[PDB]
Amino acid sequence: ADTCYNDVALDCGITSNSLALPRCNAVYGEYGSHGNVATELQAYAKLHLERSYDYLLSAAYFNNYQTNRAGFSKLFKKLSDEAWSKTIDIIKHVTKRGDKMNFDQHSTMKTERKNYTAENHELEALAKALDTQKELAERAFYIHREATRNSQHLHDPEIAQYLEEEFIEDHAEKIRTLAGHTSDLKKFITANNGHDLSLALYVFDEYLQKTV
Amino acid sequence: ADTCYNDVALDCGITSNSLALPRCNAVYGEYGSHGNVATELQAYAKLHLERSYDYLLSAAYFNNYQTNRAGFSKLFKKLSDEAWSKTIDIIKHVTKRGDKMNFDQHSTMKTERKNYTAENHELEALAKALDTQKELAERAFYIHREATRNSQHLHDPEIAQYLEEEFIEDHAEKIRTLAGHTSDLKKFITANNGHDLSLALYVFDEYLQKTV
Amino acid sequence: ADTCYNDVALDCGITSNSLALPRCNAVYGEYGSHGNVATELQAYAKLHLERSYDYLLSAAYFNNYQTNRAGFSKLFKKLSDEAWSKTIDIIKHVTKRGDKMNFDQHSTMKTERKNYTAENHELEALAKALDTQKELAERAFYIHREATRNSQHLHDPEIAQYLEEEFIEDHAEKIRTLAGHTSDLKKFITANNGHDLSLALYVFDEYLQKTV
Amino acid sequence: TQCNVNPVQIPKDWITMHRSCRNSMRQQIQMEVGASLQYLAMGAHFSKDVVNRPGFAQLFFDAASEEREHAMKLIEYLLMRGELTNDVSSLLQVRPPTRSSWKGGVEALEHALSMESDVTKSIRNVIKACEDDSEFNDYHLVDYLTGDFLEEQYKGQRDLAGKASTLKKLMDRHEALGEFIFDKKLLGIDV
Amino acid sequence: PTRSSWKGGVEALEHALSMESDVTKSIRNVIKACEDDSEFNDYHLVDYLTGDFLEEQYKGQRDLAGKASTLKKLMDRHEALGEFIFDKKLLGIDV
Amino acid sequence: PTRSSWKGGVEALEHALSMESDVTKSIRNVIKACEDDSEFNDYHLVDYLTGDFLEEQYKGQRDLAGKASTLKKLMDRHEALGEFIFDKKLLGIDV
Ligand SMILES: [Ca+2]
Ligand SMILES: [Ca+2]
Ligand SMILES: [Fe+3]
Ligand SMILES: [Fe+3]
């Protein structure tokens, strides 16, 4: 059983001429040794980073003079700021557990390839926001399962509790909110032959300005 | 892979004459598709609803002029109010996750059938309260296991964390408190041939008025 | 199905001459009946108790007139006080769940035997603190796994959430902090042939006084 | 590799405790720790669901923490006098306490009174060793043990003795209700 | 006074520690004289010297001994910077 | 990003200074393109880039250059302690 104390005893001996101390790091519970939890967490920071900029572009698009939807723009700006903040938080968690961030790490979770386009009408934009938030949420479910269930030799409840507290609880609220927005728009489009659509989009945008 | 965005692209096409958008809802992690977690959560709201009214009847019984135990009545009124509040909270969680509440949903957990009677002497009433709280607690353990362990294709840590935070932590405190009350009454009944029983029940009820 | 209510009905009968009430306790979810979770929790209180006094001796050693490192002493005193407080908290949790504390209970987790010595130079002391905190953290991972994964008939998310909230989250921070301290000392020892070591230890101790 | 700094030496004439006194202090430190562990076991016992005396549980958990503080004060005294530059690891040993169950509050209070009585006698013996060493009468430590430690001991014994007398009078006919009320009074609750 | 110069802070701290050590021994001798006079054990003065004067002496010695140990460790390679920083810390200044 | 590791604080500060220097040059080129287009001199954007963006660039470069100079002087003999102290000063902590 290698320990940091034993590494010190060995290397601090007059016989030694170095001080490697490989066990004197923050790694415990074999974090990073078994399973894919460590690499998946790095890829999760990368997903938040990419989405933060996708949301930023949507916020910009809704703030052009033709669309001019301050409420939709505010909704996306908030999603962007939150994803940017989470990117930094995950990077710090990766290093807190004794690993190092690799910005080119890929996830093993088989996820289809669909480019994010910022130029969308209101319903399309909310639908894409809903899909991307569900993807972030299901990725957290995947990492959580990898940490506490998929590998016989890996059990990391620290990562599980971190995901539960910092990601999982709030994902449900965001997804429910976005799903509700798509239902509202769907009704504006279909009821009474969609006759109130333009006034409804204006009223809905004003509502977002007050509630986002 | 069906997504809300793809449903919108298809239905918003000039070719379409409807807007179903089946994937534009709050369902993710296949909630409700595999396992019994979704139906068990609905049955859990139903159990709290039924118990809220059982506790309310016990609170009423202890407030009749013959029993007149304000402390016991307050204990049951608090249990009733908490169970009523939890009923609404669970219903809201069921809908937050994209499902719909069904008030006739039954649990699969094999639980014996024992009618709740409100007319009881003090020890009997506390014993029944203890048993019903243990049943609520074990039902939470069951749903938690169904969400994260029993089904290979179902892993829902959102439901697990919700149960951990809103139900599981507090159940231990309530059960320990009620178990302690039954121990106190047991001693009043058995020590010194139960000679101090009537004075002890009065003193104990006054104690409940100050601590419930 | 034995219940506290049924025990009362039986024992409170004119036929009875006793009041055992074996089911009127705080035990639920078969806590203590299957698996090793109950005994492991007792052994965990014992580990914290032993470590609280080991840390106390290190705090004393660093406060002797020759070492006179107030920062190192404060670091160990805090670790000691926290472990003492956790010892009492775990004992209370053991009894809250209807069990009783046994101070001679051993853990099944195969852990090597290494006496804790308080007389150490700074790097050695931090290395030992790091190792003992990793051991406390991995023991929590072990109990957590025993409660929710290792035994088919045992599922206790109350113990799991208790460990997640009261131990697991904070262990990561403490271990990362201690690992960082060993890295700093390692650099003081190796850079520029270790020429700044004595001044660096003084500066580092002053830093600990301000940040512990 | 050189991981530590070559030690330095400063004047040592100020370090004056003698062996017999120092050894008695080391033994007292272990005794205080042993008392803290025995009080933890009392706190654990009264915390059980089938005993359920939270007032007694808190009383004894508080006593356990206080005994730990007593051990720390004795250790700090030795450090102030220039001791414990070595032989620190052997100062203490944590072991399971001898007793883990009591019939009721009276038995626990009487056991606590007896434990305190033993500690008082032991401190008086440390005082004797420190004062009567033919080569060095340690005036200051004797004064510290007498004015601080014995003061706490005598007040504590009187407090426990009074609690035991008061509760024991209730045992011949009011074991359950008497202990229940007394227990809540320990929590500052007048039923 | 007998001495008017010191090589550095360590020499002065060690000299102060030795002076305090001498005072402690002298107070213990006053206590002995006052307590052991066969005709009159001066209980009150002995108590005053023990509880007030010796208390200040032992705390003071430990403080000086710690300061001397801390600074002396810096002398083999950091005499100037070590003493400079230590000196400002005495003024409550963290550079 | 192209780089993911640095030998120490000095290398990172020098890399940051070089990155900022590249950004300053790039902004000056945006200014040239916007000001010298024969069909339209964009007075307002040129002014915005000059008064806001370049202002931040020059102050930032001077700050990084000073940090690099200060820390680099400590590297020939005090690599570990020098960087440790400098690092805590960045957090506003005077050891
Ligand atoms: Ca879990
Ligand atoms: Ca949790
Ligand atoms: Fe929480
Ligand atoms: Fe004591």
For A113-144, the DSSP string reads -----S---HHHHHHHHHHHHHHHHHHHHHHH
Touching check for E94 and chain F: CB below 8 Å? Answer: yes
Name the DSSP class of C110. Answer: -
Put simply, the answer to whether D147 touches E59 (Cβ < 8 Å) is no
The answer to whether residues B31 and B37 touch, using CB atoms and an 8 Å cutoff, is yes
- Which one, of D180, D156, D190, D191, lies nearest residue D56 by Cα? D180
Spatial CA neighbour of D164 closest among D118, D116, D124: D116
Query: What region, left, alpha or beta, does residue A19 occupy, with left being phi > 0 and alpha being psi -120 to 50 degrees?
Result: beta
Torsional sign, CA C177, C180, C184, C190:
positive
Which ligand sits nearest to residue D67's alpha carbon? 4
How far are the Cα atoms of A50, C2, C102, C160, D186 from residue D59, in angstroms, in the given order?
A: 57, 35, 20, 30, 7
Q: Which two tokens stand for residue C42?
A: 């007792």
Q: What burial letters (b/e) apply to F74-89, b meaning 16+ CB within 10 Å? A: beeebbbbbbbbbebe
> Technique behind this structure?
X-ray
Q: A27: which 2 tokens?
A: 């790694």
Backbone angles phi, psi at C126, to 5 degrees: -65, -40
**Number of Cβ pairs < 8 A linking chain C and chain E:** 34
Closest CA to C118 of E70, D22, D91: D91
Q: Do chains C and D touch (3 or more CB pairs under 8 A)?
A: yes
The resolution of the experimental structure, rounded to one decimal in Å, is: 1.9
Structure tokens at B53: 């009214």
Strand, helix or coil at C13?
A: coil
Angle at alpha carbon of residue A84, lines to A78 and A85, rounded to 5°: 90
Count of CB atoms within 10 A of residue A166's CB?
Answer: 14
Helix ranges (DSSP H) in D48-170: 54-80, 105-132, 139-144, 151-168
Residues from chain B that touch C92, judged by Cβ atoms under 8 A, are: none
* Interior angle at CA D80, CA D75 and CA D84, nearest 5: 55
Which ligand has an atom closest to residue C166 CA?
A: 3
Q: Which amino acid is at D27?
A: Q
**Integer CA distances (angstroms), A178 to B27, B91, D4, D121, in order:** 12, 19, 60, 74
Overall residue count recorded for chain B in this entry: 212
Given a contact cutoff of 8 angstroms between Cβ atoms, the answer to whether D91 and D26 are in contact is yes
N- to C-terminal Cα distance for chain F?
34
| CA atoms lying within 13 Å on the CB side of residue C17 | 0
In angstroms, rounded to a whole number, what is the distance separating the alpha carbons of residues C46 and C107?
9
| Other CB atoms within 10 A of residue D120 CB | 17
- In B, residues 106-165, which contact C (CB 8 Å cutoff)? 112, 114, 123-124, 127-128, 130-131, 134, 137-138, 140-141, 144-145, 148-149, 160, 163-165
Rounded to a whole number of angstroms, the distance from the CA of C3 to the nearest CA of chain B is 6
Angle between helices B169-190 and D175-186 (to 10 degrees): 140
Using CB atoms, list chains with 3+ pairs below 8 Å to chain B: A, C, D
* CA–CA gap between residue A91 and residue A100 (Å, rounded): 8
Look-up: residue for tokens 């504006």?
A188
Given B200, B207, B211, which is nearest D176 (Cβ)? B200
Whether the CB-CB separation of D43 and D64 falls below 8 Å is answered with: yes
The answer to whether C41 touches C143, Cβ cutoff 8 Å, is: yes
Q: How far apart are CA D180 and CA B200, in angstroms?
A: 9
| Residue A8 tokens, joined | 């010190």
**Please, which residues have CB within 8 angstroms of residue F55's CB and are 6 or more apart in sequence?**
none
Kind and range of the H or E run holding A87: helix A70-96
Q: Which residues contact A209 (CB under 8 A, 6 or more apart)?
A: A70, A71, A74
Whether residue B163 contacts residue B90, with contact meaning beta carbons closer than 8 Å, is answered with no
- Residue C40 tokens read as 């492991």
d(CA A42, CA A100): 8
Contact C144, C120 (CB under 8 A): no
The rounded distance, in Å, linking the Cα atoms of C189 and C193 is: 7
Chains B and C touch (3+ CB pairs under 8 A): yes
Task: Give the Cα separation of A26 and C105 in Å (integer).
Answer: 30
Listed residue (C47, C68, C209) closest to C139, CA to CA? C47
CA torsion sign for C68, C74, C75, C76 is positive
D5 part of contact set with chain A, CB < 8 Å: no
Binding residues of D: 32, 67, 70, 116
Q: How far apart are CA D115 and CA D109, in angstroms?
A: 10
Contact yes or no for A143/A41 (Cβ under 8 A): yes
Between CA B60 and CA B195 the distance in angstroms is 28
Alpha-carbon span F79 to A147, nearest angstrom: 39
CB atoms within 10 A of CB A73: 22
Q: How far apart are CA A139 and CA A109, in angstroms?
A: 8
Query: How many residues in total does chain E contain?
Result: 95
3-state secondary structure of F57: helix
* DSSP structural state of residue E2: -
Phi, psi of E93 (to 5 degrees): -105, 120
Nearest to residue C50, comparing CAs of C116, C124, C121, C127?
C116
Closest CA to A55 of A84, A34, A30: A84
Q: What is the 3-state secondary structure (H, E, C) of chain B?
A: CCCHHHHHHHHCCCCCCCCCCCCCCCCCCCCCCCCCHHHHHHHHHHHHHHHHHHHHHHHHHCCCCCCCCHHHHHHHHHHHHHHHHHHHHHHHHHHHCCCCCCCCCCCCCCCCCCCCCCCCCHHHHHHHHHHHHHHHHHHHHHHHHHHHCCCCCCCCHHHHHHHHHHHHHHHHHHHHHHHHHHHHHHHHHHHHHHCCHHHHHHHHHHHHHHHC
Question: Which token pair is A206?
Answer: 């004003």
Helices A122-148 and A70-96 cross at an angle (nearest 10°) of 20
Whole-angstrom CA distances from A86 to A41, A42, A211, D161, E60 are 12, 12, 22, 60, 53
Dihedral sign from CA coordinates of C184, C190, C195, C197: positive
Q: How far is CA E6 from the centre of its chain?
A: 16
- Please choose, from the candidates D103, D25, D38, the residue with its C-alpha nearest in 3D space to the C-alpha of residue D66: D38
Task: Tell me how far apart the alpha carbons of residues C3 and B127 are, in angstroms, rounded to a whole number.
Answer: 8
User: What whole-number distance in Å separates Cα of residue B37 and Cα of residue B30?
Assistant: 11
DSSP conformation letters of A7-68:
HHHHHTSTT-S----TT-SS--TTTTTSSSHHHHHHHHHHHHHHHHHHHHHHHHHTTSTTT-
What residues of D form the annotated binding site for Fe cation? 32, 67, 70, 116
F84/C204 Cβ within 8 A: yes
D1-191: CATH topology? Ferritin (1.20.1260)
Report d(CA B53, CA B57) in Å as an integer: 6
Q: Which residue has the tokens 């939807």?
A: A69
- State chain A's maximal CA–CA distance in angstroms: 88
Is the CB of residue D14 less than 8 Å away from at least one CB of chain E?
yes
Q: What angle do the packed helices C197-211 and E79-90 form, to 10 degrees?
A: 20
> D1–A13: do the CB atoms touch at under 8 Å?
yes
In the numeric block, which tokens belong to residue F34?
A: 């916007």
Chains F and B touch (3+ CB pairs under 8 A): no
Cβ of B196 within 8 Å of Cβ of D52? The answer is no
Alpha-carbon distances of E47 from B178, D102, E21, E39, rounded to whole Å:
57, 43, 20, 18
Q: For residue B88, how many other CB atoms are within 10 A of its CB?
A: 12
Nearest to D125 by CA among D23, D34, D16: D23
Closest-CA residue to D163 (of D147, D190, D144, D185): D185
User: How far, in Å, are A19, A46, A128, A179, B26 from residue A131 at the CA level?
Assistant: 50, 17, 5, 10, 10
Chain-centre distance of CA B197, in angstroms?
A: 33
| Residue F30 DSSP label | H
| Residue A139 in tokens | 């990725």
Q: Which amino acid is at D110?
A: E
CA-CA distance, A4 to A10, in Å (whole number)? 10
CA torsion C104-C107-C113-C115 (nearest 10°) is -50
Total beta-carbon pairs less than 8 A apart between chain A and chain F: 3
| C-alpha of B95 from chain center | 17
Q: Do D36 and C50 touch, CB atoms closer than 8 A?
A: no
Contacts of B165 (CB under 8 A, 6+ apart): A169, C161
DSSP, res C34: S
Which residues touch A106 (CB under 8 Å, ≥6 apart)?
A43
User: Is the CB of residue C25 less than 8 Å away from at least one CB of chain B?
Assistant: yes
Q: How far is CA D59 from the centre of its chain?
A: 14
What's the token pair of residue C210? 């301000």
C64 to chain E, minimum CA–CA distance in Å? 8
Contacts 24+ apart (CB under 8 A), A80-85: A80/A52, A80/A53, A80/A55, A80/A56, A81/A52, A83/A48, A83/A49, A83/A51, A83/A52, A83/A55, A84/A48, A84/A49, A84/A52
Interchain contact, D1 vs A11, CB within 8 Å: yes
For D136, half-sphere exposure in the C-beta direction (CA atoms, 13 angstrom radius) is 13
Selection from B3, B18, B98, B95 nearest residue A186 by Cα: B18
Closest ligand to C-alpha of residue D148 is 4
If we measure between CA atoms, which residue out of D39, D24, D90 comes closest to residue D69? D39
Q: Answer for the pair C160, C93: CB distance below 8 angstroms, yes or no.
A: no
Q: Give just the sign of the alpha carbon dihedral B106, B112, B118, B122.
A: negative
Q: Which of D50, D52, D184 sits opposite B207 (nearest CB)?
A: D184
C-alpha to C-alpha distances, D143 to C191, D21, D135, E47, F18, nearest whole angstrom = 51, 13, 18, 8, 70
State the alpha helices, DSSP H only, in F1-95. 9-36, 43-48, 55-72, 79-90
CA distance D5 to chain A (A): 12
Question: Tokens 């219940």 — which residue?
Answer: C3
CB atoms within 10 A of CB C211: 14
Which residue does chain D place closest to E21, by CA atoms? D14
DSSP reduced 3-state for F14? helix
Chain D residues with CB inside 8 Å of B210's CB? 189, 191
Q: Which residues of C101-131 are buried (b: 16+ CB within 10 A; e: fewer)?
A: bbbebebebeeeeeebbbbbbbbbbbbbbbb
Q: Which residue has the tokens 């509700």?
A: A180
User: How many Cα atoms occupy the beta-carbon half-sphere of D66 within 13 Å?
Assistant: 12
Which chains pack against F, by 3+ Cβ pairs within 8 A?
Answer: A, C, E
Q: Which residues of E touch C198 (CB under 8 A)?
A: 73-74, 76-78, 82
Residues of F in contact with A99 (CB under 8 A): none
Q: Is C199 on the interface with E (CB under 8 A)?
A: yes
Answer whether B41's CB lies under 8 Å from B93's CB. Answer: yes
Burial grade of D66 (CB within 10 A; 0-12, 13-18, 19 or more): middle
CB E95 within 8 A of CB E85: yes
Q: Please tell me the number of Cα atoms within 13 Å of E35 on its side-chain side.
A: 14
CB atoms near residue C156 (< 10 Å): 29
- The distance from CA B46 to its chain's CA centroid, rounded to whole angstroms, is 8
- First vs last Cα of chain B: how many Å apart? 53
What are the residues whose beta carbons fall under 8 Å from the beta carbon of C55, sequence distance 6 or more?
C76, C77, C79, C80, C83, C129
A96 and chain C: CB distance < 8 Å anywhere?
yes
Give the span between the Cα atoms of A50 and A70, in whole angstroms: 23
Subunit contact C206:F95, Cβ cutoff 8 A: yes
- DSSP annotation of D84 reads -
Token pair 């700006």 in the structure block, residue: A77
What is the CATH topology of the domain spanning B1-212?
Ferritin (1.20.1260)
